[PDB]
Amino acid sequence: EQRRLYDQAKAALAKGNSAPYMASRSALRDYPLEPYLAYDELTHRLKSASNEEVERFLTEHGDLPQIGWLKLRWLRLLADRGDWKTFVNYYDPKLNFTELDCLYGQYQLGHGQKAEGYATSERLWLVGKSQPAACDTLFGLWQGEGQLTEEKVWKRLKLAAEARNYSLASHLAQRLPTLGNQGALMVSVAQNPAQLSQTGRFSQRDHATADVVGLGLRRLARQDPEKALSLLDYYSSALPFSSDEKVAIAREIGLSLAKRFDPRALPLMTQYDPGLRDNTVTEWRTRLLLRLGRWDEAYALTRKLPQDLAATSRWRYWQARSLQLAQPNSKEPIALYQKLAGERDFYGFLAADRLSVPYKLGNRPAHIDPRVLQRVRNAASTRRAMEFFNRGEVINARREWYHAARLFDRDELIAQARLAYDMQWYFPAIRSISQAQYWDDLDIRFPMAHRATLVREAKNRGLHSSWIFAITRQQSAFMSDARSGVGATGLMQLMPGTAKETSRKFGIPLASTQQLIVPDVNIRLGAAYLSQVHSQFNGNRVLASAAYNAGPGRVRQWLKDTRHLAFDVWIETIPFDETRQYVQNVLSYAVIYGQKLNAPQPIVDWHERYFDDF
């Protein structure tokens, strides 16, 4: 049979009544989307519904993506009724609804689990944002048992000010029995920490004033790291800083000076994390040395990395390379490069490029056991996603795919990836395979979508067509109508007014922002804008790729006062983690796409290898 009995049930159910569903339900047993109707039928009348029915539903349709919202709506009711016996049977901290977590805390306090409920209460309390109304109740009970000491108010005040939630921080500082002053001062310094210049006003030697100054110095480290450093020197002797606070201050100043390429970071970062316990401080100590051309020290530092850092392709690369820059006549790097070259990531391509050997583009579509492939195709969630796809409900089919995938093991996920690839649905295949982490299938991970369009507009703007694929692949992963909270739309994530500044310059048809999802017109403007940025930085993809992501004014800040700076070092020393990754992906992706377009692209062009603002 074939039926819209779904659609017309979903019409009546959407703002109304269950009559078509109720009659048709008998006829819709085999139909895979029927449980979505049952959900809404029950959700409407949930307050009247019995435990036995809801419980039964959660059993027989527990696999649905929207099941958590029912659990939330329902457990809220059970707790309000005082059906705690039932609440606890279903309370799942993994749903990550803080409303439930606070309700669970209430239960614990009410049911002789006071140690366990205090812990729950405090965990939820020590949080720098505002919690739901349900937690006000828990914290009320918690307070009632004399657990909300002034210290624990102070400690959350600290977190609220750190998080820039100053209305909360004010509310907390107007609840300090004795510390009301330092609390107001904490909020004042959090808002403008340059006030710490007035060393007179912040002289009082107590553990509270130390907390104020230490927050301020960490806040001030972002935007005036040089002032913060001078002020640390004053304040250290002057105030009773704990040892671990001193570390967290030095961390923040150290990293902020490191990202400005100031050698004054090195002594500080060395004093306060000598054992290399902080992975970010350790990475940026090494980056700073690479930026300053201090190859010997960088190499030394790469030999002492903790297991987790040393194991990455990054520090495997930089150990070889720092040695090669330090001792250029040594042969010891060749060995080090060989271990690493022929890995399929960015630093492997670097190591391959350094040996003058071809890149290992390891394409090995894994053998799928078809018992697994068909178990995954004979999943309820898959048939529901399959069927959503036919219909044209695109968010729904995505929703089902991704939810199903949280429980699937490495084998189950790879099966799903191959199924989505077969429907010319390139992103869910890209996303499913990346969760499985079978990186060695480059048909799936690096697809040839919109190939006639990208190659045309690359030739048009005098650009390596491998590169425009890489930008597209990195910006969206070939999701043709992608959108973001910032407002970038389409295959190439074109910002709305970025796409019209470009439309004027080149004289291109743009009669709507709803045509920036159309692959043909989205690519065409994004190709042109790419070329703006390209020509802005003398056709240097390393710089242009960074600028596409980070804006060009940033990239120019990152080029300030350089001379003959190597491309690998520049990239590594990009301050933003988001942007370093972006550049390394795009460059890597374009090596892959160079092969697939039978037009080989080395990791970098001859003219990109060294650069500066000199």
Q: Residue 527 burial (CB < 10 Å; 0-12/13-18/19+)?
A: buried
Residue 562 to residue 304: CA distance in whole angstroms: 29
And the tokens for 202? 């912040």
Task: Count CA atoms within 13 Å of residue 253 on its CB side.
Answer: 31
Q: Which are the contacts of 107, defined by CB distance < 8 A and separation ≥ 6?
A: 79, 84, 87, 88, 91, 113, 117
* Cα–Cα distance for residue pair 431/420, rounded to 1 Å: 10
Could you give the CA distance from residue 298 to residue 423 in angstroms, rounded to a whole number? 49
Helix (H/G/I), strand (E/B), else coil: 483: strand
Q: Are 452 and 465 in contact (CB under 8 A)?
A: no
- Residue pair 265/244 in contact (Cβ under 8 Å)? The answer is no
CB neighbour list of residue 253: distance below 8 Å, 6 or more residues apart = 217, 218, 221, 225, 228, 229, 232, 265, 268
Count how many Cα atoms sit within 13 Å of the Cα of residue 349 in the half-sphere of its side chain: 19
Q: In whole angstroms, what is the distance from residue 448 CA to residue 549 CA?
A: 23
d(CA 332, CA 562): 29
Q: Residues of 352-368 as b/e, b for ≥16 C-beta within 10 angstroms?
A: bbbbeeebebebeebeb
| Three-state DSSP state, 382 | helix
Per-residue exposure over 577-606, b if at least 16 CB sit within 10 Å of its own CB, e if not: eebbebbbbbbbbbbbbbbbbeeebbbbee
What CA–CA distance (Å, rounded) separates 289 from 277? 18
Question: What is the DSSP-derived secondary structure letter of residue 611?
Answer: E
Token code pair at residue 274: 């000598």
**Residue 484 CB neighbours (<10 A):** 10
SS3 content of the chain, % helix, strand, coil (to 5): 65, 0, 30
Neighbour-count burial of 274, counting CB atoms closer than 10 A to its CB (0-12 exposed, 13-18 middle, 19+ buried): exposed
Structure tokens at 33: 């989307």
- For 395, counting Cβ atoms within 10 Å of its Cβ (0-12 exposed, 13-18 middle, 19+ buried), the class is exposed
Cα torsion 448, 449, 450, 451 to 10°: value is 10
Q: At what angle do helices 410-422 and 394-405 cross, to 10 degrees?
A: 160
Sorted by sequence, the CB contacts under 8 Å of residue 614 that are 6+ apart come out as 562, 563, 564
Residue located via tokens 């048709």: 24
Would you call 610 helix, strand, or coil by DSSP? strand
DSSP 521-586: HHHHHHHHHHHHHHHHTTT-HHHHHHHHHH-HHHHHHHTTT-SSEEHHHHHHT-S-HHHHHHHHHH
Residue pair 180/172 in contact by the 8 Å Cβ criterion:
no
Q: Please name the residues in contact with 300: beta carbons below 8 A apart, sequence gap of 6 or more.
A: none
Burial of 147 (0-12, 13-18, 19+ CB in 10 A): middle
Give the method used: X-ray
DSSP character for 24?
A: H
Residue found by looking up tokens 């310059």 in the block: 505
CA distance 71 to 52: 14
The H-or-E segment that residue 404 falls in is: helix 394-405
Task: List the structure tokens of 367.
Answer: 């053998």
Report how far residue 275's alpha carbon sits from residue 341's, in angstroms, rounded to the nearest whole number.
30
Between CA 495 and CA 486 the distance in angstroms is 8
Determine the 3-state secondary structure of 217 from DSSP: helix
The angstrom resolution of this structure is 3.0
**Cα separation of 74 and 204, whole Å?**
52
CA distance 61 to 134: 28
Residues with Cβ within 8 Å of residue 383, at least 6 apart in sequence: 32, 377
Chain-centre distance for alpha carbon 236 = 36
